[PDB]
Structure formats: structure tokens, C-alpha cells
Design a protein around this ligand. Sequence first.
Ligand code: NI
Ligand code: NI
Ligand code: NI
Ligand code: NI
Ligand code: NI
Ligand code: NI
Ligand code: NI
Ligand code: NI
Lengths: 218, 218, 218, 218
Amino acid sequence: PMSLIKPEMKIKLLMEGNVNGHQFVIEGDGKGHPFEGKQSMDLVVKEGAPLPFAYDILTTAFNRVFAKYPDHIPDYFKQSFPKGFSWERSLMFEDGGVCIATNDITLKGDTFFNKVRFDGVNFPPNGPVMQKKTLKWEASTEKMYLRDGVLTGDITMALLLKGDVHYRCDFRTTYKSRQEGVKLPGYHFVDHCISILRHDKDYNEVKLYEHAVAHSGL
Amino acid sequence: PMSLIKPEMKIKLLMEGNVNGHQFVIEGDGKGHPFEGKQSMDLVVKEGAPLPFAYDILTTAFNRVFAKYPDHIPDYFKQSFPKGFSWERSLMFEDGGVCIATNDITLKGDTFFNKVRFDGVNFPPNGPVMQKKTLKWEASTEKMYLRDGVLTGDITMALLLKGDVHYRCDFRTTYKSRQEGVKLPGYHFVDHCISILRHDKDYNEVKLYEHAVAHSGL
Amino acid sequence: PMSLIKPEMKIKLLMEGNVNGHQFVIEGDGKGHPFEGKQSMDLVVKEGAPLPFAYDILTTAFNRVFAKYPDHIPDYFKQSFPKGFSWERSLMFEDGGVCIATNDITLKGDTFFNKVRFDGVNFPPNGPVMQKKTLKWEASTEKMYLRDGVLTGDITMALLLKGDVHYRCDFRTTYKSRQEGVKLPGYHFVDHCISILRHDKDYNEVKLYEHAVAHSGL
Amino acid sequence: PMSLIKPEMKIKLLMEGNVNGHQFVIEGDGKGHPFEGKQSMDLVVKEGAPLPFAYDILTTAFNRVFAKYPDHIPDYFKQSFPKGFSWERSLMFEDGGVCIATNDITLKGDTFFNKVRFDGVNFPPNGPVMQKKTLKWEASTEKMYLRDGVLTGDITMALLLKGDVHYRCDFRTTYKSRQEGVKLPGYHFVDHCISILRHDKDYNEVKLYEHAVAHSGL
Ligand code: NI
Ligand code: NI
Ligand code: NI
Ligand code: NI
Ligand code: NI
Ligand code: NI
Ligand code: NI
Ligand code: NI
């Protein structure tokens, strides 16, 4: 595919989730610059407010199209349109918490639509997630490669916690395009930095931003 | 609590799930002998038939009330009524597949009602689960203990596959009672044996059975 | 093989180890009843005394011959003589500690000789292992099966700590016989209970005991 | 400490190891440019030749001093002299193989001396490691942070195998300086690229090279 994605795109998102039994719905309205690998979004909790867990666990669920890919690495994501692609992710936290997030991404006009599901279980009640002790995800480098023919990104993630300590989470995301004839990339990397730019007291309203750049390491 | 659960009880269940993008709904009608630790259930796929993955990954999601507890070990489950209890489980397969299952169990008359959710992601497309190469779960021994005050069961599970080889899965289930004043047990074990007694060609109809016995090891 | 192992056997052992940089040597003199699955041993720290870490992490390194096997399950271990067998084990603790233990077991007369190596790394300095806060390993059930043709035992292990909490460790042991024509068992279980019967203040002298019984579950 | 490490340094190394029961000794003679983050080494198998497993599993055991650190990130390694530092590492492969590597690094004149130990267990006999099917480690990005006060590096590593597929290994290295008053860095990254430049048929003689650069991501 010869991508027709534009330098400026809009984003609409709906997330339905359940973490440690707490049900919630979050709506997102955003935009981004696909070729610059930058995007931002306004998130609003529509059901389940106020959330009783760390908002940070949800943020990476709020689209690799927004990553700056150099010409020498096939861009699986920008090639995946007009039909779109979906992804599945496991988030395994070091204290036993486990989450699964999925997103089905489609395109209508210049807007990407995202149908997101997020489920989390086994978080210790007095742990940093249920006690809202997280400050941010540190920047990261995602390792992209094919597993049984499916593009997969593995990441060593870490949440900085109050008290200046880290809490590790291992990510595995599988990406599946619905577009025919996509050229698959070889082993590569995608640097990321996700940030909550601002938020209200209970995180009912959050401004999120991500910068991502693909590269060949070394 | 002084349990009023009877020697014969009925079971009603509804599971909504999504594995590797495949959505499905399964209804269960069963019964069991709580004090003998035995139960059986008739399962029918109501939506999403025929399932494109190994039915076995779902079976343990289809109630520890059905486990023979000796008098010297507090029975967290039989004490959890009339209000009921819920559980959350992570299933981590050795080839990357990850599932989360949850069940909210309630009681009406002599019938346990089960609201079950099952989500699975990252299964390799040519793996034993997506290729339906499983034969059964082997019997197991669940290790029960408290983690940050929450009763937790960890298990070394294994699926026997065609070709006489095994496929490992690690289970962690957290159990949370809604009943006040429940007496918590110390570290103990629960032996299990779950079996599909019979099924039709595509597993649209399955007869399931479980035998479970709690003990103190040694 | 038709085992000539006797109902009463002796044991000689030498362990060379290094945990978090601390080098040590421990000698063991013991005995056991192979067909009853019971054994005991006197252990003496010969170098590296006093150990600065929890002695309990070492104890399972101090022979599955000492397990009561029923007639219907092939006994890989009692069949492994006179040539002997060796085993390798990874111990993965939940806070990042990782140990590898190995033992080459031989037989001379009525005495099993054990050449043991134990290495442990990445234990947090203020963790329960380096701070000697363990009380005992809980009893366990080892799941025995073949992995790529090699007998393997996976176990959900747990150390009881001071303060009435548990610290999890996952075990994987691979067993390899040097005896020709050994009949391999199918999937089965081995219940264990290991205990330090008594010890001096710094654990320079320890009396250890293990009871183990193989079975088919259910 | 105000580092006196020079732009050109020499390296002497001795590794004693045992993988899946195979004992070996390898000697290394090399050199590097600490401030450029580049080093190379000539490795010779002195005992245990020819190795029956993939040489690649050993290569990262053959010193973070050789990493280009920018001025804004404290360099734990170049500050660790003249007394030196040591490190411990767990290598957890996706098919069950587990290795532990350790290195005690000292300095005499302009030469770093390395006392290395490498132990590996539980590798499937027909797996890529025991069958020598690896081609190289892909480049990587190590995530550096403090865990219970100890500098730790976690990495998502991957070995490229014959047949154009990847084999994952998770690394955790803990670094411990013997030098007093070292300024600890905050969360950061170290990009790496390790390569076998050339080797003889059985890998008895190997020319190894590494390029590494520390950065703050984004
Ligand atoms: Ni084209
Ligand atoms: Ni804030
Ligand atoms: Ni009472
Ligand atoms: Ni059948
Ligand atoms: Ni015979
Ligand atoms: Ni004592
Ligand atoms: Ni200074
Ligand atoms: Ni070559």
C-alpha cells in the first residue's frame, strides 16, 4: 500500500474497561501528526468516576500509526489503511497484576476510530496501582519483530512511583492488519514517551500526549 | 458463617468472551455436590459458533464451593453465602498466550448463578490453541494462600496435546468474598481434575465435570 | 532396570555455592528409606560461615530416589542405577532473585554421592532472603512430565516468612539418567514436605528432613 | 569520583562455565575506547572444545565502562575505579533455558581484569541453543534503574535464528560498585549492539565487538 494518511489526522476513541472489579467507560477526542510520531488526546471518564486505581495503567491503550518511521523500515501501520488494523496487548506487572487491552482501529475521512477494551485483575489492594501511587511511565523502547508471522512488540516498561522507586511491567502487543499486501518489517525498534500533560483531581479529565520514533538501533 | 449450602445444588452460567478477536457467548446449566467436591455442567455455544480455538482453554472458567474441604481447613467458599463471592484469574501460557477470566457468583434458592467473562490474546496463529490441538488439562494441585490479605490460588497447569506432549499454563486466581466475618484459611492445597466427558464435533455442546479436594499436603 | 536400591541407604554430599557474591561450601552426611520416600541429613558449613542469606533457599538442593513411587508409575530415579543421574534446577523468586542448582548423583556401595553447585543472584539487599526472614518452605506438589524428551518437574513453591506472609518461587528441575533403557513415566505428581528439624544459631549446623510421595492426582 | 579511565584501555578475561552439563573455560584478550562505548576481544576456548551449544548465549558475559555516557547522566561505571565493580545477570530464555552470569571487574595499570562465571540449565536438547541454530543477538536497549538501591538493567533481548525467526531472552543485570561515594544515575537507557566479527568453524576462536551508548530516551 502507498499510504494516503495525512500529516494531520483526528482521533475518536471509546474505552470500556474493568479493573479489579471496577467498571468504567472513557471517551477520547484527539489528533496527531502521523509522520512526526506525535499525538495528543482529551480523555473523559463517562462511567465509573472517580476511578479507584492509577490512571497510568490505562494510558498506552489510548495507535502505532503515530510513530515516525524512517524510509528504510517498512511501516506496517501507515500501510494498514483504508481497512485498518487491530492490536492486542498483555501487561504483566511485577506484583501479579495482569491486564489485557485491545483496540480495533478504523478510519473514516481523516479520523481514526478506536474501539478499546481494557481488563485488569490480581492487583494487590494495597499495591501502587490500587493505591494510586504512580507518577508516570518512563520513556521506553519497543522491540518489534514477527512471532509466528504476526508483528509483535515486546517492551520493558516501568512506572515511576511516589518515593522515587520503579514498578515494572512487561508488555507484549500483537498487531494485525486487515489490509492486503502489507510489506512486513524486520526486527526494529520504536522509542516512546507517553505523558499525562495535565489532569483534574480525580483524573475524570486527562490531557495525554505521546511521541514515538522508529529506528534500527546501534 | 455457618454454611447452609446443601449437599445438592444447581448451577446457571453465562460466559461472554473474546479470544484472539473471536467473540462468543456460552450458556451453562449444571449441578453439583458441594461437600463431595464434584460438579457437572451442560455447555452450549449461543454466539460465535463454531469456536476457532481449543475449548479446553475455557473450561476452568466454568466455583471453588465445589471442593471437598476437611474440617481443619476453613472453607472460604462455603462461608461466602448468602452474599456470594467473585474471582479473577490470569492464565499465562508458555507460548505467549494470555487470558483473563472473571466470575461473579451469586445464590438464589438452591442455584448458583455465574456471570463469567473470558478474554484471550497473543495466541500464535499456528499454536496448539488456535489450531485446536489440545486433548485435556491434566489433574492439578492448586496452592492456596493469602497475598496482601486476598485469598490466592497459584497453579502449575498443563494441557496434554496431540502427539503426546504438554503445553504449560500458569494460573493465578484471586478470590474475594462479599460475606462479612469469613474465617480465612492458612496455606493449603486443592487437588483438581477437570474433564470434558463428551462433546459434539465442534464443541457447540459440551458435558463438563470437575472433582476437587482440599488438603494440607505432606 | 530392575532396581537393587535397598530399603536403607546412606548419603554423602558436597555443595559449592555463591549467593549474591558470598561464596560457601557445605558438607552433608545423611541417610534415607527410598521406598518410604523419607530422608534426613546433617549439614555443616565448611567455608563461608556464617551465611548472610536465608538457609532455606538451599535446602531442596540437599534426590528424587527418596520418593515413594506406586507400582503404576515408572520410577525414573530408582531405575537410574548403578550409573546414576543428574539434575539441573532454576529457582525463580518473585522479587527477582534467581538461582541455579545442579547435582550429579552417583552410587558406591549403599551410599549415594552428591556433587552439588548452587548459584544465586539478583536478590534485593533488603529482601527476605538477604535479610534472613524465611521460616520454611511450605509443602508442595511437583508436576512431572517430559519436555522435549527430558523428565521435568515444575513446582509452585512458597516460603513462609516472618509476619505471616508468603514469598513465591517457581521451580523447574530437569532430570537426566545415565542408565540405559530406563522406562519413562507419563504425567504425574510428587508431593513433598521439606523441613529443617533443628539448627544452631547461624545455621552452620542443620538437620534436614524430606518426605515425598508420587501419585496420579485426582 | 573523578574518573582517570583513559580513552584507550586493555582487557583480560577468564570465563569458567557449565551449560547443560558441559564444562568449559574461555580466555579473552581485548581492548576498547571507554568514552566511545566500543570494545573488541579475541576469545579462545581453553577447555571443553568444541562447545556443543550456541556461542551467542555467552557473548554478553564477555563491562558497562564501555558505553558512551553523556554528561547529564551519572556514569556509575567510570566512577567505579580504582576499586572496581561486579555484576550479576540472569538470562531467562523463552523455552525454559536459564543462565546466570557474573563478572568481578578489577583494574591494574590500564587493563581491566574480568573473572567471569557462566552457568546454563534447562535448555531443551533439540532447542536452538543446544542445536547451534543462533545467528546473532539483535541490537538492544537496556533500561537502567535502581531496585532496592542497586543499579539494575532490564533488557528485552532476542536471538535471530536460522530460518528467519527470533528467540527471546529476558535479561536482568545488577551492578555493584566497590568504590565509595559513587553518584547514582536516575532512570536511563543504554543502547547496545554486540557482534561476533569472525570465528573459526567450531567457535574455538572468536573475535567479538560491542558498541553501546547511554541516553535519556524520548
Ligand atoms: Ni506497493
Ligand atoms: Ni499531576
Ligand atoms: Ni461463626
Ligand atoms: Ni473428544
Ligand atoms: Ni526391564
Ligand atoms: Ni529455628
Ligand atoms: Ni566528586
Ligand atoms: Ni559465521
